[PDB]
Design a binder for this molecule. Structure first.
Ligand code: HEM
Length: 199
């Protein structure tokens, strides 16, 4: 990998796939009840990167970053389902520095992949205007919007030392996501999708 954005993906594809498999494994779209659990998980994760999107310094290296946050859309999705705002039990990670960049990558990247989730959400009468607001595509199209975001990432001009932290940060973001998922769907700690399952 000769670029920052590509190295991130490279060092996190395995953990990313474990996330994809685990989410699918818990049947988020099998019922309104389960979907609600999926929204709560999403809520927590996006609440946890809300301070990163609105990060002064980061908004200098990346334009309109703050406006890319999906936390509100998720809370509104919860509203549409008859649920009041959800709040995590434990303490929410509040990452900063280069490791927080990894978290940003994780959250922003998840948009790129919400297409699949968006499609299955729409099978439950949940679309970008109701219930699946947080999954709808960026007005400019997931592809474009993302490739652009990528330029900004590769633009930070982080040193190998910096990337190392950001990448470790991206792994930790993916790890947290699974911790919340397990708790939200009532699984044991360290629970994973059936071994051998492919995304
Ligand atoms: C079962 C649910 C999920 C599915 C089916 C899924 C699927 C995918 C797919 C197909 C892409 C393709 C993007 C493209 O090349 O156009 C992608 C990208 C991405 N996903 Fe997932 N994903 C899921 C959940 C998540 C979650 C919950 C996170 C993180 C908390 C995550 C983070 C990312 C990241 C960071 C990227 C960007 C990868 C890159 O560097 O191009 N995904 N995902």
């Amino acid at each position: 990998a000769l670029t920052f954005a590509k190295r991130l993906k490279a060092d996190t594809t395995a953990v990313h796939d474990s996330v994809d498999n685990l989410v699918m494994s818990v049947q988020p779209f099998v019922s309104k009840e389960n979907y609600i659990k999926f929204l709560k998980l999403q809520s927590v994760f996006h609440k946890a990167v809300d301070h990163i999107y609105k990060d002064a310094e980061l908004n200098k290296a990346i334009p309109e970053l703050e406006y890319m946050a999906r936390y509100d859309a998720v809370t509104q999705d919860l509203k549409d389902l008859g649920e009041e705002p959800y709040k995590f039990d434990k303490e929410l990670p509040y990452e900063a520095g280069n490791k927080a960049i990894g978290w940003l990558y994780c959250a922003e990247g998840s948009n790129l992949g919400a297409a699949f989730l968006f499609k299955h959400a729409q099978k439950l009468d949940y679309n970008g205007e109701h219930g699946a607001r947080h999954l709808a595509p960026h007005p400019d199209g997931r592809g474009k919007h993302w490739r652009a975001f990528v330029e900004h990432l590769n633009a930070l001009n982080l040193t190998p030392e910096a990337e190392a932290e950001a990448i470790q940060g991206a792994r930790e973001a993916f790890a947290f996501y699974k911790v919340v998922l397990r708790e939200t769907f009532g699984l044991a700690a360290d629970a994973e999708a059936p071994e051998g399952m492919m995304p």
